Amino acid sequence: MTILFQLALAALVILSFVMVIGVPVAYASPQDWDRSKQLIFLGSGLWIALVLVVGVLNFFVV
Amino acid sequence: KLPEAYAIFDPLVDVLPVIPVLFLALAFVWQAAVGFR
Amino acid sequence: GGRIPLWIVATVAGMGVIVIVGLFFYGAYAGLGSSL
């Protein structure tokens, strides 16, 4: 599935690029320590899951 | 060459290793933000 | 007088030179003076 691997890999890239800027702002903004706790936790699992998914797909198109 | 699958990422890969220097440059942007307290 | 914070202008300026210099080092390998 050459197209679903390139999909997930950009999902990774755009999500890194998101969370790269987002986690440090979230962390040092005192307003929403709670409005954002959920956020970064979900991105984190999203990122991790994405890496595994890109990691297995690699072996179908490598 | 990278694996041909990841070839679209060749220009992103060419710039990645300079990124650690931006951290040093970013620390100075930050102290100018806070006026070198 | 003081509408644009100084740290901003600093970064702008800096990224400005970095570009110009970067270009001069590019030119050391392209075109006139590259030995090629």
Partner: peptide
Amino acid sequence: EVIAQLTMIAMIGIAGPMIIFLLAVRRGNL
């Protein structure tokens, strides 16, 4: 091609100053 290189490093490089910029608006804890 080398615009790809430059658009990538244009975005990466502004990434930093932006975090600083965001946290300044939000009276973040710089």
